[PDB]
Subunit: 82 residues, 2 copies
């Protein structure tokens, strides 16, 4: 279980590599892959996720809900500072 999906540029729709995904209260980050893909493994619960990449506004999405069972599919669209 956890949160799965893609981090993408909100302007182009391109998947963004090297974006850092943080979970509030948990000192363990992950980074997106070459297609913008990620899968953050978490036990079921509610979490606040922050996604950061140089050149983009930081994105915080609150109260994201991880269930028992399959990963919660969530994409994150990062806004360039531009």
């Amino acid at each position: 279980s956890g949160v799965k999906g893609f981090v993408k540029d909100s302007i182009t729709g391109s998947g963004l590599e090297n974006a850092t995904i943080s979970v509030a209260g948990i000192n363990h980050n992950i980074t997106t892959g070459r297609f913008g893909d990620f899968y953050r493994l978490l036990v079921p619960g509610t979490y606040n996720l922050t996604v950061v990449l140089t050149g983009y506004m930081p994105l915080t999405v609150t109260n994201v809900v991880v269930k028992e069972g399959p990963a919660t599919e969530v994409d994150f669209s990062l806004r360039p500072h531009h």
Copy 2:
């Protein structure tokens, strides 16, 4: 909640890459990007920061207060040895 901002050179005003910010008591230090940017989540509280970069004088910033909500903005200026 956390910290974000830039590390810059005190002479040029330009951003510094690969500076490290170490937060006392918190594992996993903070590294700056290409133009000096950094970001890290921290729970609300008060933190003591040390900023180092080989070839620069280290900087100590105490009593940095982190409140709920957006990251706390703070910049650091490093002087070249």
